[PDB]
């Protein structure tokens, strides 16, 4: 309160450090338990949507910066990053011109 | 009629993005809610003096 | 469950119409090879010219059918691409309506097989023309 | 009564957009036949070349 | 899906707001009952004196 | 912020509002108890006199 | 490229609590980088098509004379 | 789709069956919502009398 | 012109598809009474509310959409007239040179 | 990675010491300087490949 009555009270949040994940052995609920239903449902649908992205895009959604600074990943990009080779065929009358010497 | 006016305001609030409007019904319902609250307060004062 | 089953039926129709498109692509490039070979011994001759005319108009009819298959695959792939939470979804003015060009499955694929059979017919008749002129 | 008058105006504009959508359907459906005639003319001009 | 999550959070907020308004006008009612009772308790003091 | 941090912030607000509703409910029940005890005490002393 | 990258900037006017980074930021930056890459490869292949048609025109010039 | 391609496949029967199921589904859900709000009204109507007689 | 017709068609179809839900909402608000049930205490709405339009601005938005729809229909008829003249010119000019 | 871990660790403090002191200013300057430097390195690697 804001009064002459005043108390410095600490309070701990619900799904942090006080609740657990669901299972059939812990099935129905205990009414005394801080089961925060809103964060539980939201984080369930968030995890369902979260599992689709690959792992570098998961660790960009973490707190500390363990991610690779360059945005395109190694295992997804078909081209080499900062590769110097590029086959340019000079047009000369006579011999045969061709394309895509990178992937033959 | 407090229940009637509040439920009408709620169902009118669940409207799509362009048909949600600053309507004549909205001003009448706001005045109705205010008038019902003041009338209820006067009725409670009469009850206490009774 | 009903939405998943509708996705399965739509993908089945995609897998039918893509097969028809690729096999008509095969027939189209075989007609291109045939017109070029018949030209290369054209360079009896009146019969060669008039079956060149028949072969050209058959090629144009299968070309029209091939373009129709192209746009039909584009429409069905887009219709499966669209899903929950996109802006295009709306209540329609008349969802249930049978339009003017109503035809059935049997008549549709017998028509497509019919113009393919015509194509193979003038290919074969052209082959004994090829061997008679040679 | 305020609810009633807003309902009447909304009904009128809904029916008007119904008429406009139907007319645009009919206009596009009659424009497609010119493309059919165009393609037939393209065939019968591909022959004379 | 992002704007759907925002809408879910809005609905949670407005639920708690409705309950909160009910609490605060109940407590104002109890406070005015306490004031009326205080004056009624004040008068027998004058009687006893 | 990250979406988990954003969602935990709004649930912390909702739990604070729920806690304050709980404190007000306990306070109003104790107001009613103070009223009934006070009335009984004054009337008992009145009747002894 | 128009629609995706102005979608990004028209999103990023957000206030303090909802100034965040969801999956939409990451998917949109991947979108604009890959559309940019498609632009460069189609530009290069258009350039090589122009060179091929130059060779075709040159062979026409030397063959219609002979 | 154009003139030769309106094929009337299995998809049109599937879609009309889904729509035809769906108006009945939404109608039954509105009916149950009305029933539930009627029940809440009845519980208030007796809670008032209990609260007065106490 | 066919695809441009389609996209203004679905845009005006959006502006019509709002109306069915809003009309059902206002009709459901019309059928309340005092003796009827299903009215309740929802006290957020009087204190706090969001606004997006006035009736004249809503009507003006509908005029803008319907105007652009009618322009896009009429431009198609203009191009159809050009198609008529061009194909008659093509048939005449090929026949005269062939003869 | 080291800088962002310092940011979250120092932000997890208790109530009578959650202070925007000079340490948090220097940590923000570190985050900005690191990201500018590594993006400049990215562009320089592109030019050296070209």
């Amino acid at each position: 309160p804001m009064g002459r009555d005043a108390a410095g009270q600490l309070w701990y949040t619900g799904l942090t450090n006080s609740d657990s994940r669901e299972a059939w052995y812990t099935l129905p609920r205990a009414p005394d338990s801080p089961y925060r239903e809103a964060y539980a449902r939201w984080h369930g649908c968030y995890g369902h949507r979260e599992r689709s992205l690959p792992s570098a895009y998961t660790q960009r959604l973490r707190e500390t910066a363990w991610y690779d600074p360059i945005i395109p990943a190694q295992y997804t990009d078909p081209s080499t990053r900062w590769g110097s080779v590029l086959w340019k065929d000079r047009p000369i009358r006579g011999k045969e011109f061709a394309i895509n010497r990178h992937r033959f | 009629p407090l229940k009637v006016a509040q439920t009408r305001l709620y169902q009118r609030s669940h409207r799509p993005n362009v048909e949600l409007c600053r309507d004549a019904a909205q001003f009448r319902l706001a005045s109705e809610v205010e008038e019902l609250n003041l009338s209820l307060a006067a009725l409670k004062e009469k009850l206490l003096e009774a | 469950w009903d939405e998943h089953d509708n996705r399965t039926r739509l993908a089945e129709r995609i897998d039918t119409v893509s097969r028809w498109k690729e096999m008509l692509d095969k027939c189209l490039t075989d007609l291109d090879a045939e017109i070029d070979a018949l030209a290369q011994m054209k360079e009896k001759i009146s019969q060669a010219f008039e079956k060149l005319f028949l072969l050209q108009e058959a090629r144009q009819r299968l070309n029209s059918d091939h373009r129709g298959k192209m746009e039909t695959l584009d429409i069905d792939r887009g219709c499966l691409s669209l899903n929950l939470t996109s802006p295009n979804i709306s209540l329609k003015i008349n969802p249930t309506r049978v339009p003017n060009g109503s035809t059935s499955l049997q008549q549709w694929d017998d028509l497509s097989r019919f113009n393919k059979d015509h194509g193979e017919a003038e290919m074969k008749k052209a082959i004994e023309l090829r061997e008679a002129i040679a | 009564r305020k609810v009633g008058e807003r309902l009447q105006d909304m009904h009128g504009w809904k029916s008007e957009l119904q008429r406009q959508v139907e007319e645009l359907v009919s206009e596009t459906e009659l424009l497609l036949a010119q493309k059919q005639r165009l393609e037939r003319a393209l065939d019968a001009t591909a022959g004379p070349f | 899906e992002r704007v759907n999550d925002i809408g879910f959070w809005k609905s949670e907020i407005i639920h708690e707001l409705d309950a909160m308004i009910g609490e605060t006008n109940e407590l104002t009612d109890i406070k005015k009952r306490l004031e009326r009772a205080l004056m009624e308790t004040e008068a027998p003091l004058q009687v006893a004196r | 912020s990250v979406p988990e941090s954003w969602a935990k912030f709004t649930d912390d607000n909702i739990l604070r509002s729920q806690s304050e509703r709980a404190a007000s409910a306990k306070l109003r029940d104790d107001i009613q108890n103070v009223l009934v005890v006070t009335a009984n005490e004054m009337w008992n002393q009145f009747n002894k006199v | 490229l128009k629609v995706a990258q102005t979608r990004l900037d028209e999103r990023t006017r957000r206030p303090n609590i909802e100034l965040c980074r969801d999956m939409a930021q990451l998917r949109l930056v991947n979108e604009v980088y890959e559309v940019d890459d498609t632009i460069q490869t189609l530009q290069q292949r258009l350039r090589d098509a122009e060179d091929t048609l130059q060779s075709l025109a040159h062979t026409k010039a030397t063959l219609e004379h002979d | 789709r154009p003139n030769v391609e309106l094929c009337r496949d299995q998809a049109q029967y599937g879609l009309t069956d889904e729509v035809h199921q769906l108006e009945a589904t939404i109608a039954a859900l509105k009916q149950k919502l009305a029933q539930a709000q009627d029940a809440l009204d009845a519980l208030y109507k007796h809670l008032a009398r209990l609260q007065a007689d106490i | 012109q066919i695809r441009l017709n389609w996209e203004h068609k679905e845009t005006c179809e959006m502006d019509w598809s709002d109306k069915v839900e809003a009309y059902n909402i206002d009709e459901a608000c019309c059928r309340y009474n005092n003796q009827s049930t299903d009215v309740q205490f929802y006290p957020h709405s009087a204190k706090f509310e969001e606004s997006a339009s006035t009736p004249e601005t809503w009507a003006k938005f509908t005029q803008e959409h319907l105007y652009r729809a009618e322009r896009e229909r009429l431009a198609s008829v203009n191009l159809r007239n050009l198609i008529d003249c061009i194909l008659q010119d093509t048939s005449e000019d090929l026949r005269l040179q062939c003869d | 990675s080291i800088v962002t871990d310092n940011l979250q660790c120092r932000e997890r403090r208790q109530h009578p010491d959650l202070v925007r002191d000079c340490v948090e200013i220097e940590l923000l300057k570190e985050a900005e300087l690191i990201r500018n430097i590594q993006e400049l390195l990215k562009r320089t690697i592109k030019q050296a490949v070209s």
Side-chain angles (χ1 to χ4, degrees):
Chain A
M2 300 136 267
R4 67 184 71 188
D5 181 77
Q9 168 183 350
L10 283 72
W11 58 291
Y12 64 96
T13 60
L15 289 202
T16 74
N17 314 122
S18 179
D19 210 17
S20 177
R21 58 194 58 85
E22 67 181 2
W24 83 100
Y25 56 83
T26 186
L27 189 64
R29 183 61 65 190
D32 194 31
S33 303
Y35 163 65
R36 259 301 188 186
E37 191 258 334
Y39 205 92
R41 178 183 318 235
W42 179 85
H43 195 251
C45 277
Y46 180 42
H48 185 195
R49 265 77 173 185
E50 172 36 69
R51 282 162 187 165
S52 174
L53 262 174
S55 304
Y57 310 127
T58 71
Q59 62 155 345
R60 282 177 184 88
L61 297 179
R62 294 301 101 71
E63 160 66 37
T64 53
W66 312 106
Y67 53 70
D68 291 331
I70 318 293
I71 299 170
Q74 269 295 340
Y75 41 85
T76 55
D77 190 31
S79 171
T80 179
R81 294 180 293 173
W82 294 273
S84 298
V85 59
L86 183 63
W87 292 97
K88 270 180 208 80
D89 285 328
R90 292 174 176 86
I92 287 303
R93 280 86 59 197
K95 274 75 68 178
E96 288 197 3
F97 182 76
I99 197 64
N100 276 347
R101 294 185 190 273
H102 294 85
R103 274 42 201 171
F104 182 76
Chain B
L2 294 174
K3 312 175 98 170
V4 181
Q6 286 166 77
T7 317
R8 282 174 190 265
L9 279 169
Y10 171 70
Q11 295 297 289
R12 277 193 70 83
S13 170
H14 266 283
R15 265 184 311 164
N17 46 3
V18 69
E19 314 282 326
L20 172 153
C21 183
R22 189 182 99 185
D23 209 42
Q26 306 271 101
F27 323 121
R28 188 46 167 188
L29 283 194
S31 62
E32 179 181 332
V33 165
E34 182 65 26
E35 206 160 7
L36 287 180
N37 281 28
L38 298 184
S39 310
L40 183 63
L43 277 178
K44 293 193 187 318
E45 182 75 35
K46 292 316 160 178
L47 189 55
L48 279 185
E49 210 170 1
Chain C
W1 297 344
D2 270 355
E3 190 276 331
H4 186 74
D5 209 51
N6 290 14
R7 293 191 293 203
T8 59
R9 311 142 190 273
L10 213 51
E12 181 75 70
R13 277 314 311 299
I14 297 192
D15 295 3
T16 296
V17 69
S18 81
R19 161 179 103 83
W20 264 106
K21 181 266 289 181
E22 296 198 64
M23 71 87 78
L24 287 199
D25 271 5
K26 165 213 173 181
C27 276
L28 259 187
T29 187
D30 285 20
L31 293 174
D32 204 299
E34 192 46 274
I35 66 162
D36 216 335
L38 192 49
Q40 289 293 297
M41 294 185 287
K42 190 182 196 289
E43 61 205 59
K44 282 279 187 50
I45 175 169
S46 70
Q47 293 90 294
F49 183 55
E50 71 86 30
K51 295 183 289 294
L52 275 178
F53 188 75
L54 283 164
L55 185 60
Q56 171 72 255
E57 57 88 16
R59 169 206 171 258
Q60 294 205 244
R61 197 197 278 274
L62 281 71
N63 201 1
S64 87
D65 203 79
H66 171 226
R67 175 138 274 280
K69 264 52 181 203
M70 210 46 49
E71 50 86 10
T72 315
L73 281 72
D74 202 353
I75 296 169
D76 61 57
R77 293 181 184 271
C79 183
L80 261 183
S81 179
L82 188 153
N83 68 307
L84 294 174
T85 187
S86 294
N88 184 341
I89 297 90
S90 289
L91 281 153
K92 246 65 192 174
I93 190 167
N94 281 317
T96 302
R97 41 171 300 272
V98 178
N100 299 313
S102 83
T103 188
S104 178
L105 292 203
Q106 181 194 3
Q107 313 219 357
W108 162 77
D109 69 348
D110 71 44
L111 179 61
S112 303
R113 195 189 61 254
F114 187 104
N115 68 22
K116 184 173 151 43
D117 282 329
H118 262 281
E120 296 213 314
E122 94 277 339
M123 290 216 187
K124 204 172 41 193
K125 300 296 290 295
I127 297 294
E128 69 273 15
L129 178 76
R130 290 287 316 133
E131 293 292 329
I133 294 172
Chain D
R1 297 285 75 78
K2 299 292 180 68
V3 176
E5 55 89 13
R6 182 58 184 247
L7 192 68
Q8 187 182 6
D9 301 349
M10 202 175 248
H11 175 85
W13 264 119
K14 158 167 81 165
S15 196
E16 172 53 51
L17 277 177
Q18 184 177 2
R19 294 295 180 270
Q20 176 74 10
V21 161
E22 182 294 334
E23 293 179 353
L24 196 150
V25 170
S26 189
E27 170 52 47
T28 286
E29 190 276 331
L30 276 296
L31 188 153
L32 184 58
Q34 280 69 240
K35 211 171 71 53
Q36 313 283 10
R37 183 180 171 97
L38 172 61
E39 269 146 21
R40 292 170 275 199
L42 184 50
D43 187 12
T45 49
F49 180 71
Chain E
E1 75 200 7
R2 175 61 189 276
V3 65
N4 294 325
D5 291 331
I6 291 177
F8 170 78
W9 280 122
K10 270 152 46 189
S11 162
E12 301 315 297
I13 296 296
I14 65 171
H15 183 187
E16 176 65 29
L17 290 185
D18 299 357
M20 183 46 167
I21 301 299
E23 175 263 314
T24 190
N25 66 8
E26 283 179 352
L27 183 62
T28 58
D29 186 74
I30 297 304
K31 210 191 53 173
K32 71 175 184 287
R33 204 71 41 61
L34 200 48
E35 305 166 311
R36 185 32 201 150
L38 172 43
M39 295 298 103
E40 170 57 37
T41 53
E42 192 294 333
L45 183 63
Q46 167 184 309
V47 168
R49 290 155 171 277
Chain F
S1 67
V2 74
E4 293 212 26
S5 60
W6 164 66
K8 193 53 182 173
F9 164 71
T10 179
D11 281 329
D12 288 1
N13 268 332
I14 289 308
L15 194 150
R16 205 192 193 285
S17 168
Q18 287 184 348
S19 179
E20 190 66 30
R21 283 204 289 140
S24 303
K26 296 316 169 187
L27 192 42
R28 85 198 164 87
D29 270 3
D30 284 3
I31 296 169
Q32 214 282 331
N33 165 53
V34 161
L35 188 153
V36 63
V37 171
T38 286
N40 273 9
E41 283 313 303
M42 294 182 287
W43 195 67
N44 279 359
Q45 193 62 39
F46 170 81
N47 209 3
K48 276 175 49 187
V49 178
Chain G
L1 161 64
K2 284 319 171 303
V3 61
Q5 189 274 331
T6 191
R7 156 171 313 178
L8 205 53
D9 190 327
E10 201 256 349
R11 182 191 174 190
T12 187
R13 298 280 77 81
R14 269 176 316 167
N16 194 306
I17 297 304
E18 293 83 3
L19 190 56
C20 72
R21 158 202 61 201
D22 208 325
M23 291 146 197
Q25 273 274 294
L26 282 75
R27 289 295 199 183
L28 276 164
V29 296
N30 296 341
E31 167 84 32
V32 291
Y33 281 115
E34 69 95 12
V35 168
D36 189 359
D37 185 32
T38 317
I39 300 299
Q40 286 101 27
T41 187
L42 277 184
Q43 282 181 1
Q44 183 35 50
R45 265 281 280 261
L46 160 67
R47 183 177 292 171
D48 271 354
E50 171 207 322
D51 175 41
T52 309
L53 188 153
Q54 183 178 1
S55 66
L56 294 174
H58 216 302
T59 54
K60 273 311 300 293
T62 190
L63 194 149
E64 66 183 1
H65 164 85
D66 186 74
Chain H
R1 291 176 288 129
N3 54 5
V4 65
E5 311 284 345
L6 278 76
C7 203
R8 185 179 67 189
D9 46 352
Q10 192 68 26
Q12 62 84 30
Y13 281 152
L15 284 173
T16 187
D17 293 331
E18 182 165 37
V19 172
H20 214 304
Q21 181 85 261
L22 271 185
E23 71 274 15
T25 295
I26 304 177
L29 262 71
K30 296 183 290 294
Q31 193 257 336
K32 274 322 300 203
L33 178 56
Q35 270 263 11
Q37 291 205 323
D38 169 79
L40 179 55
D41 168 74
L43 276 295
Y44 290 166
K45 273 182 176 168
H46 287 295
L47 188 153
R49 314 170 71 163
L50 284 172
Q51 184 35 269
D53 272 295
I54 281 166
Chain I
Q1 285 310 121
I2 284 164
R3 68 184 68 188
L4 211 58
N5 276 16
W6 281 338
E7 62 90 18
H8 293 89
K9 185 213 292 283
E10 65 89 18
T11 305
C12 290
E13 162 86 342
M14 283 319 300
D15 205 14
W16 177 86
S17 176
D18 286 17
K19 311 283 186 180
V20 183
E21 317 164 1
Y23 189 87
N24 198 4
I25 278 155
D26 279 317
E27 188 175 0
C29 300
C30 182
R31 63 200 60 270
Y32 293 160
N33 296 115
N34 265 341
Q35 75 171 358
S36 180
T37 174
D38 80 17
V39 298
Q40 278 147 11
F41 262 89
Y42 299 172
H44 188 267
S45 43
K47 314 192 81 213
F48 293 97
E49 194 91 353
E50 62 268 62
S51 49
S53 64
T54 79
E56 58 93 16
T57 303
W58 163 59
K60 186 261 294 176
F61 173 79
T62 315
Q63 331 288 340
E64 208 83 9
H65 273 250
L66 194 151
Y67 181 75
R68 290 206 264 122
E70 190 64 30
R71 171 183 219 174
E72 201 65 279
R73 164 185 186 273
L74 294 174
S76 292
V77 176
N78 189 6
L79 196 66
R80 197 262 305 158
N81 294 7
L82 261 183
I83 279 177
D84 291 331
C85 292
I86 284 285
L87 276 296
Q88 281 279 29
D89 186 74
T90 300
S91 187
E92 182 173 351
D93 291 331
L94 211 51
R95 204 211 51 260
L96 60 89
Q97 195 71 43
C98 183
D99 182 41
Chain J
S1 310
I2 293 171
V3 165
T4 59
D5 209 313
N6 296 115
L7 263 179
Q8 66 92 31
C9 202
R10 256 192 53 89
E11 182 270 339
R12 259 195 165 85
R13 266 171 313 177
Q14 267 278 355
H15 186 273
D17 274 308
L18 194 56
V19 180
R20 187 166 174 85
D21 43 357
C22 56
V23 191
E24 201 85 345
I25 302 303
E26 300 295 328
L27 281 182
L28 287 172
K29 292 216 300 181
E30 272 187 339
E32 279 284 346
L33 182 52
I34 282 166
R35 197 177 337 130
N36 304 343
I37 278 179
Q38 62 182 7
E39 191 276 332
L40 173 61
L41 288 181
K42 184 203 191 133
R43 314 171 71 52
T44 314
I45 294 161
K46 290 225 186 306
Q47 168 59 33
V49 168
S50 175

